[PDB]
């Protein structure tokens, strides 16, 4: 006892338990994945509807930090909105100061040093949020970064965050990043977001998809989920 | 603008005009200059208007809270001292404030005079304003300690009449008050155009 | 239970307990029901009193010319987020010379109530807001929580035994869209009559009803302009 | 006369053995009530009874 | 700096440090005091003096203005700051309203200060009770005591310190209106009341008076022995 | 287990506010009654010994001219709220040139009923009774340490609260007059006090539109008790 | 950072400062060192064993000058040593700016002792685990002072700190004496550092500094290897 | 240098009736010798029963109008009722004195009904003194209005003149005559004339054009 309470105390085996408890706090939240193609970044978040709870489009875990950068948060939600406001403000500082649009590398550093900066004191608690960062610029290419509650930021071609995490990142190695256009990769996400999280746990669900890349011309926005409706047209035909 | 204050055997008499200009132009003829602070205190106005209104009003604040704490109505010299401590900190910013403080106390009649520079002096007689030097002259000839009530009313109205006559910056009504032991009481408000028929002969 | 101490300490299960105990402070407040149409928003609360002689403690408080909020739980913190609510309304009313839409107001409540849920020695706010107003795109019914997770619903209810209000609302959510005010309100406080035990009224002296509309500024009615709404309801069944 | 939906959604973290005690306490009050028939509101009555905790109420907390 | 609430409510409703820190009042020197209709008299007892060493530095009856006398119990160290702050307060009152300091005002100052000294963060509450006696302007004498709660409270006579129930129970047998019809009956009344107090060998009894216009007079051990003489001779007349 | 001074309960609410409510129970009692003509009010001084002078004890201080008050529990905590509530009424009068209504006083106090913490110590241990006559008529109010402020028509507090309320709904109706209510309080007081009721134990306080002011003097109370 | 600021160093029921005693035990776990004042200047000797043959002795120095006439060594832990090294570096220079004069070592140990004693009481720190030896040649008589984690300061003739300081203390009780020369202090200093060393002592093990009265000069491994050749 | 004051002009008129109050202002907003606009009304609705006018420097009129219309709704949110006309005078005295050492350049006139159905017109100055008056006139044409309202409403310097109180119809041709005959010689009195009537039954507004130069 006594080694798990505060964040600033090492445990005798040599790890920090508040950080380890922060890692598996995101483990209870629902699955949200991401993947990049050769010219764009595709997001997808499965969202939970039990009976009535909310109007369609409530508390969307897809955010929009800059003109060309977006979030895909999973875990506890309020601190994820706090990181959305802070990363928003950091893009405002870089945009105001140095005159050009923020690269995804500096944004990953300046956010990840804050997420780390709340794991050094017993003033605060470590965050309980993990989020994706997708972007595209013609002098940059599509990058996809992944920030955990511990503060580690690095780069995937594809990732997954949630309960069904390993099962939802098992199948991504079947897909090919290098050749595919992202317009395929939309339904190529929605097929396994429909496949993972089988409906015995929760009766119903609802899907969000957000898509930035070359076709949207740098601007990040949600795809019109009604428009082309490619998800469930493949997904009801993907059970057999 | 001429106020005057003098104490005699029965309390304190305060009188003032009502004209308040702005340059050569006259803004209004009915500015009530003698500002009521409490039911037992009377303050006047000189020079600037908003400064005397504001700082006497803020004096009334601390006087009322003082009464709510010590269960005693505040003495006159205490009110003058608090007013001087409030005015003094702004020395060098350009307040023009020539007020007077009048009231009854445990020591009897009372009168003090507070300048924006920081003057604070007790006295028998005073007159403040542009036409004040016109008021000391007629005021010091008929004054003694022993006067009757109607005599002091006639003197304190005559002096305002000479002030509004000779000076140009004084005119309008003649607002006359009376301070006694049981709290002040208004006497009258005679217009100068009616008073010229009276004292002209 | 040594990790039930403060807001800083995470659980070994991943559930920060101070938030759960503050949710318990949400459930201890009285019932209130907010539900919208496409053209209006109605939130109805139920007062309780300390004794017979004391007047009933009110819930619905006026905030802006279109924003109104219910409450359950603590009262002083409701005045705190009330004063912050007024001040952030008339800030942008002072600067931009337009009223604020609701959907960017509530992010100031989340980012306002966030920091007292993280740093040491700061409690969360026992709070029960049911926000209602107009932006240009119609009505909105939100709810808050001390964990600062705001939900865009079509109808919710928070307070003591408010789950019965929900299980009323789900079998009428297909019919709570088209109808106008006079049956929308009684469709509101039927959920309140299911939040009570079935042997006492449903009086006139306790229920308060607030409506926000397009040609109708946000208005609170109190027992006597309420008395024209409570007339003509069905009897509680056997 | 049971919807089964209301008693379901009002249960959070409540144990399954406590759900048996719900029909117990609701059956124990049936004695003093004089009627062995129960209502759907009696479930949620005994459901909120055993948990959260007992028996006190929130005052002084503003 | 120093952000920690020292003094919090106990679950049975009490503050501890207020309603516990009166034990430091209970384990200090005693002090009594009555008010005459003309001359007041207060005095400290149980001095426990070394009886071969100096005595003016252990003097624990002092003044704020000449209008106001002090007397206190408990540990004197915390009382010193209360006295000096009270003096700095009662001088600016002379800088304001030109009457001397009324005693009820200065007791509201020590009481209000000691209250907010309990209320604030990171501050141990004071462990003193004190008396504030002074014949005011318009010649009227009265007295007040303090409290570590900060509740000023006007008595007719005193018992604070060790055995306050003993002397406070004793002065009910004092309060016949004959006492005090004379000022020598008031002073010998205080010392005869301190007979039931600790040892009362004529050494640890330090008394001081104030004759309603005079500065306070620390009496030498000259008439204390004569008041013990007429008190013991009066007890010789009591049988 | 001295935990966070600002920590919620398992029930749960604020631990220290819930502990603060129990501090009202050992304080002295009081009785307020709202009349259509005014507000009468009663308290007990609780004389501890014949050493003490009885009339220096304050349980009623009068906030403005037209807003009365009644304190309870720890008095030295109450004095701070009294002195600052007076400042808030005067600030209302000097921005506004009108009387601060009886309602907004208790918002102006109960907005800082909860300011304890470490940054930005303990909550107050008083239960106040505010009276007064604004333009809305004679109002009778009541605030707690929690800040949960409510109107009460005829409120008791303190140690006697249970028996005084419980006995007090029996003897109250809508059309009470003043001198009926004044002798309707002292019956309850002489039931609930431990010393003999006389001229030194209690004090009344009345405030009316047309009987003002009409504060609180002795030898009125001598006529008041002898009407029993 | 938070304003916690409470002193974790409190009194015992006996009345003993506990963290200062434990910090003196952490001094006793440190490397041995000895320093001898003798009649023209002061010789400080320290004992530095690299834990491997991989290490470099040219990088880290233990005898560290503070002025051009003041040296300073320790017996304790280096990471707590270098902080008050730098604090003494900045601290002497305000004396050289105000008074325009080479600062006396007596004034140094007063001020550094004030820093350390003032640091034992402040908000939530452990005390330093360092016991210093401070030498220098001011106004004609060379000085040797010792401080400690209690903030105290002594004026020793020829002392020793670190491991086996009762062994080197009794050795410096008899073998240290009335008066020597500068080279004669080096012999007995290398001997008393050769009391508790390993089986070999080279130019990389010891590192010896002196104060001439004409000025400081830290010695080189050439002469440090030449004097210990000549076992002591 | 940068001199932070500039004079715009405009002329505010207010007449307190028996149960009414008429506040009227010209609309010509002009800087220097140019004309910026020919429609810019000064009369501002605060409550149902209190209408303020603000002339002088224009940016301080906008700023002051917005601060007042903020603190009204703060009072309504605190104390469950609107501000009285007497309270707005004291609050505006405190606001206008709050910036005393870098003053507003604004002449203020508040009209509106009191508690008892009577005309209560208050006037001001940039330093912040105030008084209750039956009729006032600020702005650039005060000296072209005030003795005329003295000759019509105040009844000064007239012998054998019986006293009729001001009726509702008479005050309107007063305001129209003073803005026409005042607008003939003045330069800052302009084309459109806003007239606001405050009755017990709400706020009535009427606008009559004038000469176009």
| CA dihedral of F160, F161, F164, F170, whole degrees rounded to 10 | -160
Residues of B noted as catalytic: 1
Residues 6+ apart with CB under 8 A from B72: none
| Structure's resolution in angstroms | 5.8
Q: Report the domain count for chain G.
A: 1
| Smallest Cα distance from E51 to chain F, Å | 34
User: Would you list the DSSP string of E159-217?
Assistant: -BSTTHHHHHHHTTTT--TTTTSSHHHHHHHHHHHTTSSS--SSSS-EEEEE-SSSPPE
Helix (H), strand (E) at residue F165: helix F161-168
HEC readout, chain D: CCCCCHHHHCCCCCCHHHHHHHHHHHHHHHHHHCCCCCCHHHHHHHHHHHCCCCCCCCCCCC
**Chain D stretch 19-58, residues whose beta carbon is closer than 8 A to a beta carbon of chain F:** 52-53, 56-58
Q: Is B118 exposed, middle or buried (0-12, 13-18, 19+ CB in 10 A)?
A: exposed
d(CA A235, CA A192): 8
Q: Is B180 on the interface with F (CB under 8 A)?
A: no
Where b means 16+ CB within 10 Å and e means fewer, C69-105 reads: bbbbbbbbbbbbbbeebbebbbeebeeeeebbbbeeb
Per the annotation, binding residues of B for bortezomib are: 49
Does CATH number 3.40.50.620 belong to domain A1-240?
no
Nearest to B61 among F63, F83, F90 (CB): F90
Does C151 lie at the interface with A, CB-CB under 8 angstroms? yes
* The two structure tokens encoding residue A178: 């290098």
List the domain boundaries for chain C.
1-238
User: Which residues from H are below 8 Å from B32, CB to CB?
Assistant: 131
Own/partner contacts of E84-89, CB < 8 Å, gap of 24 or more, are E85/E113, E86/E110
Annotated binding site of B: 49
Phi-psi region of F146 (alpha: psi -120 to 50; beta: other; left: phi over 0): alpha
Angular region, D45: left φ>0, alpha ψ -120 to 50, beta rest: alpha
Domain ranges of chain H: 1-213
The Cα–Cα gap between A142 and A138 comes to 9
What is the per-residue DSSP string for F48-79? --TTB-GGG--S---SSSS--EE--S-HHHHH
Interface test with B, best of F84, F93, F94, F215 (most B CBs within 10 A): F94
Q: Is-cis flag, bond preceding B62, omega within 30? A: no
Query: Which domain, by its residues, includes E191?
Result: 1-239
Q: Can you say whether residue F46 is alpha, beta or left, with left for phi > 0 and alpha for psi between -120 and 50 degrees?
A: left
E132: left (phi over 0), alpha (psi -120 to 50) or beta: beta
Q: How far is it, in rounded angstroms, from Cα G202 to Cα F82?
A: 82
Total number of domains in chain E:
1
Tell me which residue of G86, G59, G58 sits closest to G72, measured CA to CA.
G86
Distance CA A155, CA A158 (A): 9
Q: How many distinct helices (H) and strands (E) make up chain F?
A: 6, 9
- Does an interface of 3+ CB pairs under 8 Å exist between F and H? yes
Q: Thinking of the domain H1-213, which architecture would CATH place it in?
A: 4-Layer Sandwich (3.60)
Q: Do the chains contact at B25 and H136, CB–CB below 8 Å?
A: no
Of the partner residues B57, B58, B68, the one whose CB lies closest to the CB of residue F86: B68
β-pair partners for G45: G34, G208
Structure letter (DSSP) for residue C103 = G
Closest of G40, G36, G34 to residue G142, by C-alpha = G40
Separation of alpha carbons C114 and B22, rounded Å: 56
CB contact under 8 A, F90 and B64: yes
- C129: phi then psi, degrees, rounded to nearest 5: -65, 135
Sort out which chain F residues have CB atoms less than 8 A from B65's CB and list them: 86-87, 90
At E159, which CATH number? 3.60.20.10
SS3 string, B27-92, reads EECCCCCCEEEECCEEECCEEECHHHHHHHHHHHHHHHHHHHHHCCCCCHHHHHHHHHHHHHCCCC
* Angle between helix D40-50 and D16-33 (nearest 10): 120
- Indicate the DSSP class of residue C12: S
- Interface touch C198/D41, C-beta < 8 Å: yes
Which is nearest to H52 in space by CA: H130, H115, H99, H122?
A: H122
Query: Which of D44, D58, D62 is facing C76, going by the closest CB pair?
Result: D62
- The number of CA neighbours under 13 Å toward the Cβ of A5 is 9
Q: Is C166's CB within 8 Å of D44's CB?
A: no
Interface membership of C150 toward F (CB under 8 Å): no
As a whole number of angstroms, the distance between CA H88 and CA D3 comes to: 59
Give the closest residue to H134 by CA, choosing from H123, H145, H148. H123
- Burial readout C29-40 (b: 16 or more C-beta within 10 A, e: otherwise): bbbbbbbbbeeb
- Put simply, whether C35 touches A (Cβ < 8 Å) is no
Domain ranges, ordered by start, for chain B? 1-201
The CATH number of residue G148's host domain is: 3.60.20.10
Experimental method for this entry?
cryo-EM
In 3D space, the residue among C214, C234, C43 whose CA is nearest the CA of residue C129 turns out to be C43
The reply to whether residue A58 touches residue C152, judged by beta carbons under 8 angstroms, is yes
Note down the domain range covering G91: 1-232
F14·C123 Cβ contact <8 A: yes
Chains A and F touch (3+ CB pairs under 8 A): no
**Which two structure tokens, joined as six digits, stand for H96?**
């206008």
User: In angstroms, what separates the C-alpha of D43 from chain F's closest C-alpha?
Assistant: 21
Q: Is the CB of residue F19 less than 8 Å away from at least one CB of chain D? A: yes
- Return the CATH number of C1-238, one of 2.60.40.10, 3.60.20.10, 3.30.870.10, 3.40.50.360: 3.60.20.10
Query: For residue F151, what are the contacts with CB-CB under 8 A and spacing of at least 6?
Result: C54, C55, F139, F140, F141, F142
Cα separation, C194 vs C56, in Å, equals 20
- Which CATH code fits B1-201? 3.60.20.10
Residues shown for chain E: 239
Chains D and F are in contact, defined as 3 or more C-beta pairs closer than 8 angstroms: yes
Q: Distance between CA atoms of F126 and F117, rounded to whole angstroms?
A: 18
């Amino acid at each position: 006892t006594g080694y798990d309470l505060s964040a600033s105390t090492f445990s005798p085996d040599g790890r920090v338990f508040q950080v380890e408890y922060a890692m598996k706090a995101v483990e209870n939240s629902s699955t949200a994945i991401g993947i990049r193609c050769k010219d764009g970044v595709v997001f997808g978040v499965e969202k939970l509807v039990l009976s009535k709870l909310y109007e369609e489009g409530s508390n969307k875990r897809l955010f929009n930090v800059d003109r060309h950068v977006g979030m895909a948060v999973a875990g506890l939600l309020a601190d994820a909105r706090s990181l959305a406001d802070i990363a928003r403000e950091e893009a405002s500082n870089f945009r105001s100061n140095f005159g050009y649009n923020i690269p995804l590398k500096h944004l990953a550093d300046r956010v990840a040093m804050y997420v780390h900066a709340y794991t050094l004191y017993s003033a605060v608690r470590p965050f309980g949020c993990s989020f994706m960062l997708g972007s595209y610029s013609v002098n940059d290419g599509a990058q996809l970064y992944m920030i955990d509650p511990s503060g580690v930021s690095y780069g995937y071609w594809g990732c997954a965050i949630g309960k069904a995490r390993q099962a939802a990142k098992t199948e991504i190695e079947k897909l090919q990043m290098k050749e595919m256009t992202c317009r395929d990769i939309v339904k190529e996400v929605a097929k396994i977001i429909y496949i993972v999280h089988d409906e015995v746990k929760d009766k119903a669900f609802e899907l969000e998809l957000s898509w930035v890349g070359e076709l949207t011309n740098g601007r990040h926005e949600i795809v019109p989920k009604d428009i082309r409706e490619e998800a469930e047209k493949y997904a009801k035909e993907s059970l057999k | 603008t001429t106020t005057l204050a003098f104490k005699f055997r029965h309390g304190v008499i305060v009188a003032a005009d009502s004209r308040a200009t702005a340059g050569a132009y006259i803004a209004s003829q009915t500015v009530k200059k003698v500002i009521e602070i409490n039911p037992y205190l009377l303050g006047t106005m000189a020079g600037g208007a908003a400064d005397c209104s504001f700082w006497e009003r803020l004096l009334a604040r601390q006087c009322r809270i003082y009464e709510l704490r010590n269960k005693e109505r505040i003495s006159v010299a205490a009110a003058s001292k608090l007013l001087a401590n409030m005015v003094y900190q702004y020395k060098g910013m350009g307040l023009s404030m020539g007020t007077m403080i009048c009231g009854w106390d445990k020591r009897g009649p009372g009168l003090y005079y507070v300048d924006s520079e920081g003057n604070r002096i007790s006295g028998a007689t005073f007159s403040v304003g542009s036409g004040s030097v016109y008021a000391y002259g007629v005021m010091d000839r008929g004054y003694s300690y022993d006067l009757e009530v109607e005599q002091a009313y006639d003197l304190a109205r005559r002096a305002i009449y000479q002030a509004t006559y000779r000076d140009a910056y004084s005119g309008g009504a003649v607002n006359l008050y009376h301070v006694r032991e049981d709290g002040w009481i208004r006497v009258s408000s005679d217009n100068v155009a009616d008073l010229h028929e009276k004292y002209s002969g | 239970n040594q990790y039930d101490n403060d807001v800083t300490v995470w659980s070994p299960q991943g559930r920060i307990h101070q938030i759960e105990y503050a949710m318990e402070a949400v459930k201890q407040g009285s019932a209130t029901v907010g539900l919208k149409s496409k053209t209006h928003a109605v939130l109805v609360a139920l007062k309780r009193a300390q004794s017979e002689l004391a007047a009933h403690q009110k819930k619905i408080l006026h905030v802006d010319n279109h924003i109104g909020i219910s409450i359950a739980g603590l009262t002083a913190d409701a005045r705190l987020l009330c004063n912050f609510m007024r001040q952030e309304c008339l800030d942008s009313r002072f600067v931009f010379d337009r009223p604020l839409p609701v959907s960017r107001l509530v992010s100031l409540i989340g980012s306002k109530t966030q920091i007292p849920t993280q740093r040491y020695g700061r409690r969360p706010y026992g709070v029960g807001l049911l926000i209602a107003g107009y932006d240009d795109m119609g009505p909105h019914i939100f709810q808050t929580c001390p964990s600062a997770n705001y939900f865009d619903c079509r109808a919710m209810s928070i307070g003591a035994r408010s789950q019965s209000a929900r299980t009323y609302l789900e079998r009428h959510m297909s019919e709570f869209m088209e109808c106008n005010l006079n049956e929308l309100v009684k469709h509101g406080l039927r959920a309140l009559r299911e939040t009570l035990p079935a042997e006492q009224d449903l009086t006139t002296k306790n229920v308060s009803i607030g409506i926000v509309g397009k040609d109708l500024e946000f208005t609170i009615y109190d027992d006597d302009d309420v008395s024209p709404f409570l007339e003509g309801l069905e009897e509680r069944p056997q | 006369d049971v919807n089964y939906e209301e008693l379901a959604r009002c249960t959070d973290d409540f144990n399954g053995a406590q759900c048996k005690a719900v029909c117990v306490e609701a059956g124990m009050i049936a004695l003093r009530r004089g009627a062995t028939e129960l209502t759907h509101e009696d479930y949620m009555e005994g459901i909120l009874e055993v948990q959260a905790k007992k028996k006190a109420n929130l005052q002084y907390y503003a | 700096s120093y952000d920690r609430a020292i003094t919090v409510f106990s679950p049975d409703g009490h503050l501890f440090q207020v309603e516990y820190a009166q034990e430091a009042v209970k384990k200090g020197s005693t002090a009594v005091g009555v008010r005459g209709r003309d001359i007041v008299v207060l005095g400290v007892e149980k001095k426990s003096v070394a009886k071969l060493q100096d005595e003016r530095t252990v003097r624990k009856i002092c003044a704020l203005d000449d209008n106001v006398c002090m007397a206190f119990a408990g540990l004197t160290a915390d009382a010193r700051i209360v006295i000096n702050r009270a003096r700095v307060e009662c001088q600016s009152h002379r800088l304001t309203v030109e009457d001397p300091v009324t005693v009820e005002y200065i007791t509201r100052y020590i009481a209000s200060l000691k209250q907010r000294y309990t209320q604030s963060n990171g501050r141990r509450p004071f462990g003193i009770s004190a008396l504030i006696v002074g014949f005011d302007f318009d010649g009227t004498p009265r007295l007040y005591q303090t409290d570590p709660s900060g509740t000023y409270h006007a008595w007719k006579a005193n018992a604070i310190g060790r055995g306050a129930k003993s002397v406070r129970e004793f002065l009910e047998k004092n309060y016949t209106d004959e006492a005090i019809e004379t000022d020598d009956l008031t002073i010998k009344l205080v010392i005869k009341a301190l007979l039931e107090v600790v040892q009362s060998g004529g050494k640890n009894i330090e008394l001081a008076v104030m004759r309603r216009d005079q500065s306070l007079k620390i009496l030498n051990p000259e008439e204390i022995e004569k008041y013990v003489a007429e008190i013991e001779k009066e007890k010789e007349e009591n049988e | 287990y001295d935990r966070g001074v600002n920590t919620f309960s398992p029930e749960g609410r604020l631990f220290q506010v819930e502990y603060a409510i129990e501090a009202i129970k050992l304080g002295s009692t009081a009785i307020g009654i709202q009349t259509s003509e005014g507000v009468c009010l009663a308290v007990e001084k609780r004389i501890t010994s014949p050493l003490m002078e009885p009339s220096s004890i304050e349980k009623i201080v009068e906030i403005d001219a037209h807003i009365g008050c009644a304190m309870s529990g720890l008095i030295a905590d109450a004095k701070t709220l009294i002195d600052k509530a007076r400042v808030e009424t005067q600030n209302h009068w000097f921005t506004y040139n009108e009387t601060m209504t009886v309602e907004s006083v208790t918002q102006a106090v109960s907005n800082l009923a909860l300011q304890f913490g470490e940054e930005d110590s303990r909550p107050f241990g008083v239960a106040l009774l505010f009276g007064g006559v604004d333009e809305k008529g004679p109002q009778l109010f009541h605030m707690d340490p929690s800040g949960t402020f409510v109107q009460c028509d005829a409120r008791a507090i303190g140690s006697a609260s249970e028996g005084a309320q419980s006995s007090l709904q029996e003897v109250y109706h809508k059309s009470m007059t003043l001198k009926e209510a004044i002798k309707s309080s002292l019956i309850i007081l002489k039931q609930v006090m431990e010393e003999k009721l006389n001229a030194t134990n209690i004090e009344l306080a009345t405030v009316q539109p047309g009987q003002n002011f009409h504060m609180f003097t002795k030898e009125e109370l001598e006529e008041v008790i002898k009407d029993i | 950072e938070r304003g916690y600021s409470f002193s974790l160093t409190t009194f015992s029921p006996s009345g003993k400062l506990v963290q200062i005693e434990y910090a003196l035990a952490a001094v006793a776990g440190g490397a041995p060192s000895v320093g001898i004042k003798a009649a023209n200047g002061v010789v400080l000797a320290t004992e530095k064993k690299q834990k491997s043959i991989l290490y470099d002795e040219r990088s880290v120095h233990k005898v560290e000058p503070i002025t051009k006439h003041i040296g300073l060594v320790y017996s304790g832990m280096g990471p707590d040593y270098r902080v008050l090294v730098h604090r003494a570096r900045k601290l002497a220079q305000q004396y050289y700016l105000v008074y325009q004069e080479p600062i006396p070592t007596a004034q140094l140990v007063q001020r550094v002792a004030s820093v350390m004693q003032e640091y034992t009481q402040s908000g939530g720190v452990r005390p330093f685990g360092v016991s210093l030896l401070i030498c220098g040649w001011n106004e004609g008589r060379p000085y040797l002072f010792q401080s400690d984690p209690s903030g105290a300061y002594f004026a020793w003739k020829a002392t020793a700190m670190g491991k086996n300081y009762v062994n080197g203390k009794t050795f410096l009780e008899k073998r240290y004496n009335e008066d020597l020369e500068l080279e004669d202090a080096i012999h007995t200093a290398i001997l008393t550092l050769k009391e508790s060393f390993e089986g070999q002592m080279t130019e990389d093990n010891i590192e010896v500094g002196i104060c001439n009265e004409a000025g400081f000069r830290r010695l080189t491994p050439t002469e440090v290897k030449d004097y210990l050749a000549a076992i002591a | 240098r940068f001199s932070p004051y500039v004079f715009n002009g405009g002329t505010i008129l207010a007449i307190a009736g028996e149960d009414f109050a008429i506040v009227a202002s010209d609309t010509r907003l002009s800087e220097g010798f140019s004309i910026h606009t020919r429609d810019s009304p000064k009369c501002y609705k605060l409550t149902d029963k209190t209408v303020i006018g603000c002339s002088g420097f224009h940016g301080d009129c906008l700023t002051l109008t917005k601060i007042i219309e903020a603190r009204l709704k703060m009072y309504k949110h605190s104390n469950n009722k609107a501000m009285t006309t007497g309270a707005i005078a004291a609050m505006l005295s405190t606001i206008l004195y709050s910036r005393r050492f870098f003053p507003y350049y604004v002449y203020n006139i508040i009209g509106g009904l009191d508690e008892e159905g009577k005309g209560a017109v208050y006037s001001f100055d940039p330093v912040g003194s105030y008084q209750r008056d039956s009729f006032k006139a600020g702005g650039s044409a005060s000296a072209m209005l005030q003795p005329l309202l003295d000759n019509q409403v105040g009844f000064k310097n007239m012998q054998n003149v019986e006293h009729v109180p001001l009726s509702l119809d008479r005050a309107m041709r007063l305001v129209k005559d003073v803005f026409i005959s005042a607008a003939e010689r003045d330069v800052y009195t302009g084309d459109a004339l806003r007239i606001c009537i405050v009755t017990k039954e709400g706020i009535r507004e009427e606008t009559v054009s004038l000469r176009k130069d």
